[PDB]
Amino acid sequence: MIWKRHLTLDELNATSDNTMVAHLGIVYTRLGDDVLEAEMPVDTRTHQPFGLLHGGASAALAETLGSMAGFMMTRDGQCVVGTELNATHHRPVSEGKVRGVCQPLHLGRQNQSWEIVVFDEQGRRCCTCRLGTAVLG
Amino acid sequence: MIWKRHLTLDELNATSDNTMVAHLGIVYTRLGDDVLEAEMPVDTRTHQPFGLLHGGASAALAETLGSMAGFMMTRDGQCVVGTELNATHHRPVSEGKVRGVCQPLHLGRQNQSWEIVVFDEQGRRCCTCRLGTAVLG
Ligand SMILES: CC(C)(COP(=O)(O)OP(=O)(O)OC[C@H]1O[C@@H](n2cnc3c(N)ncnc32)[C@H](O)[C@@H]1OP(=O)(O)O)[C@@H](O)C(=O)NCCC(=O)NCCSCC(=O)c1ccc(O)cc1O
Ligand SMILES: CC(C)(COP(=O)(O)OP(=O)(O)OC[C@H]1O[C@@H](n2cnc3c(N)ncnc32)[C@H](O)[C@@H]1OP(=O)(O)O)[C@@H](O)C(=O)NCCC(=O)NCCSCC(=O)c1ccc(O)cc1O
């Protein structure tokens, strides 16, 4: 696979401890050869004042996924940090939960780029994001 | 002021009820003639696994501010939605609060562009964001 670090879903959902990831109901749901996935609830934790999925929640979901993916691409003595994020909101989400699908675009030695697409519970694309990360040391 | 809607901090902080805005502990601290500002905690609620401020938290604060600012430029009936978000993470923050400052770059009839700068307690710029919005109809 692509990953340098080999971790289980249980282990991934364990780093979440008392952070924003956990705080937002984000759960890592799949780890494939070259893809990381997570789901996140659409309720009062992730709402904006009109009752729709807060665009900021999709963003945070994307930075989470890209960073964790970045982390699993590093050797034992390295850190990975999100440096650059962008996101396009195509469709509102009023109900259910969303799934984020993160895949590599560029896996460099000093920095990387990740794609994260966010789907609603009908598999409809609602948000496209890209995260650039920095590998340190 | 420039806002179509004459609201108050109290009015603004009331909209946060039962949303992601309240969940992240974000509170609007300044409503100026042409500036909106909110503060957000850097604690477990907004941390990432290294005990630093989660980049997605800064993003969520930015989208909150830009959207709220954008609503306040709408005549009754109209709605405002965030469409494009970008964010550059310049500096880590680990404790205290951060402050988001939102100002208009371009106020058009169907499209708006907002700048949100996020500062740490020393007043250093930690994150720069831009939010595109859509007015309808
Ligand atoms: C590391 C850089 C990218 C480059 O550094 P630069 O170009 O040389 O800039 P300078 O070094 O010259 O000065 C900067 C200041 O920073 C300090 N510092 C210094 N060196 C280092 C270092 N090696 N490492 C760290 N800090 C360093 C110094 O105090 C220095 O201050 P000054 O003394 O100069 O006043 C830097 O811009 C940065 O840390 N951005 C923060 C982005 C961020 O936090 N994003 C969100 C969090 S990560 C994603 C996430 O949420 C996530 C992760 C995992 C997961 O599973 C799930 C998740 O969701
Ligand atoms: C409004 C657009 C910008 C126009 O694009 P377009 O040219 O019209 O494209 P289409 O019409 O062809 O798309 C059609 C499909 O999507 C729909 N559709 C369209 N209009 C509506 C509608 N009014 N209602 C429902 N659906 C609509 C239809 O369902 C339709 O279904 P289909 O027929 O396809 O089956 C659009 O890109 C959009 O809504 N993006 C979502 C952004 C977002 O969710 N941001 C995050 C939340 S807001 C910020 C925030 O967090 C925040 C705010 C305030 C605050 O105080 C604090 C805060 O933090």
Curated annotation (Swiss-Prot), chains A, B:
Effect of residue 54 to A: 229-fold decrease in activity toward salicylyl-CoA. Loss of activity toward benzoyl-CoA
Any single biological process term in GO: enterobactin biosynthetic process
Outcome, altering residue 48 to A: Loss of activity
A GO molecular-function annotation: thiolester hydrolase activity
UniProt: substrate binding residues: 48, 54-55, 82, 89-92
One cellular component (GO) term of this entry: cytosol
Record's note on what induces expression: Induced by iron starvation.
CDD domains for this protein: PaaI_thioesterase
Pathway participation: Siderophore biosynthesis; enterobactin biosynthesis
Entries under Gene3D superfamilies matching the protein: Hotdog Thioesterase
A Pfam family: 4HBT
Listed result of changing residue 67 to A: 140-fold decrease in activity toward salicylyl-CoA
Main localisation: cytoplasm
Superkingdom of the organism of origin: Bacteria
SUPFAM superfamilies referenced in this protein's UniProt entry, alphabetically: Thioesterase/thiol ester dehydrase-isomerase
Entry keywords, A to Z: Cytoplasm, Hydrolase
Catalytic residues as annotated in Swiss-Prot or TrEMBL: 63 (nucleophile or proton acceptor)
Family according to the record: Belongs to the thioesterase PaaI family.
Subunit structure: Homotetramer. Dimer of dimers. Interacts specifically with the aryl carrier protein (ArCP) domain of EntB.
Matches recorded under PANTHER family: 1,4-DIHYDROXY-2-NAPHTHOYL-COA THIOESTERASE 1, PROOFREADING THIOESTERASE ENTH
Protein name as it appears in the record: Proofreading thioesterase EntH
